[PDB]
Amino acid sequence: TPSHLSDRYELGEILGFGGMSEVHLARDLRLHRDVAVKVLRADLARDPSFYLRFRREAQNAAALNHPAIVAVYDTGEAETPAGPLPYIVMEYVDGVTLRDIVHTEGPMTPKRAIEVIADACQALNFSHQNGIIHRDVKPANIMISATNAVKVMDFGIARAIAQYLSPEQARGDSVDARSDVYSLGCVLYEVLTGEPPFTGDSPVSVAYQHVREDPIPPSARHEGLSADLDAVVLKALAKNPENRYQTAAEMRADLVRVHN
Ligand SMILES: Nc1ncnc2c1ncn2[C@@H]1O[C@H](COP(=O)(O)OP(=O)(O)CP(=O)(O)O)[C@@H](O)[C@H]1O
Ligand SMILES: [Mg+2]
Ligand SMILES: [Mg+2]
Numbered sequence: 001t002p003s004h005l006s007d008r009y010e011l012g013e014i015l016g017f018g019g020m021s022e023v024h025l026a027r028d029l030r031l032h033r034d035v036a037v038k039v040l041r042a043d044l045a046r047d048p049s050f051y052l053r054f055r056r057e058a059q060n061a062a063a064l065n066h067p068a069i070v071a072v073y074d075t076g077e078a079e080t081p082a083g084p085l086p087y088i089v090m091e092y093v094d095g096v097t098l099r100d101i102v103h104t105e106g107p108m109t110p111k112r113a114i115e116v117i118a119d120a121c122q123a124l125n126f127s128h129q130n131g132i133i134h135r136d137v138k139p140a141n142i143m144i145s146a147t148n149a150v151k152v153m154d155f156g157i158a159r160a161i162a163q164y165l166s167p168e169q170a171r172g173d174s175v176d177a178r179s180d181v182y183s184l185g186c187v188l189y190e191v192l193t194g195e196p197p198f199t200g201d202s203p204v205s206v207a208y209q210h211v212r213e214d215p216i217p218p219s220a221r222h223e224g225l226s227a228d229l230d231a232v233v234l235k236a237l238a239k240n241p242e243n244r245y246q247t248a249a250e251m252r253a254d255l256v257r258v259h260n
Contacts, residue, residue, distance in 0.1 A: 068123035098139035119150040121252035137183035162206040185236025
């Protein structure tokens with residue numbers, strides 16, 4: 001991976017990485033601001049299957065303009081000794097994922113958890129109103145700013161109409177907005193208790209539990225939780241889509257009521 005992309009974005013420290021890409025802190029040399037730059041692996045860049053999915057991620061996230069969703073500024077293909085190197089320029093979020101927060105600090109106070117998920121609901125609901133289902137809602141894809149703002153990211157498998165998968169999504173079924181609602185329920189359960197609703201020694205077991213087993217009410221796993229919060233989480237985690245919040249807006253309206 002090179003020094004600068006397109007003679008414009010000076011690459012700095014790695015912020016995150018996975019199996020198909022990496023994210024750098026970078027400096028926009030024209031605009032004089034720091035940005036987050038996602039770069040496709042390069043050996044994968046020669047693969048149309050991966051090259052297209054990466055471009056689709058950029059296009060999906062660029063279709064959304066919301067203060068709680070990571071904004072896309074630019075996209076390109078840098079010239080390297082390897083060949084073309086696809087990249088996406090995004091707003092830099094100075095913060096941490098919920099995955100990091102729960103791992104270092106443990107469960108959040110109910111009040112903070114309610115605010116954080118209410119804000120995530122609002123982002124997802126916006127996505128849905130714009131015909132996009134995220135499908136990868138999980139703590140590693142939600143960050144909290146240095147200003148306490150929530151930012152939903154990673155539209156890598158979003159579609160334009162184990163521990164966090166909805167039962168429909170497990171079966172690669174028709175997944176809709178109520179699948180994101182379920183995944184939000186899982187994320188909420190985890191920031192309230194420190195653990196997701198189901199764990200197991202394998203992915204199929206975790207999947208079997210999502211499909212067949214009722215979650216343990218959150219108050220039974222962790223002290224200081226109301227029966228009303230149990231009810232909200234347990235309704236988001238309902239097995240049948242007809243029994244969950246029908247939209248993320250509805251989930252938020254109920255969380256706000258627990259708060260107020
Ligand atoms: N705009 C941004 N600002 C700050 N950090 C960011 C960021 N975008 C991503 N990150 C950091 O990098 C991590 C990975 O981001 P992201 O979820 O977009 O990658 P990814 O899941 O697509 C990797 P892969 O698909 O290769 O496994 C995030 O959890 C976050 O820590
Ligand atoms: Mg991710
Ligand atoms: Mg990805």
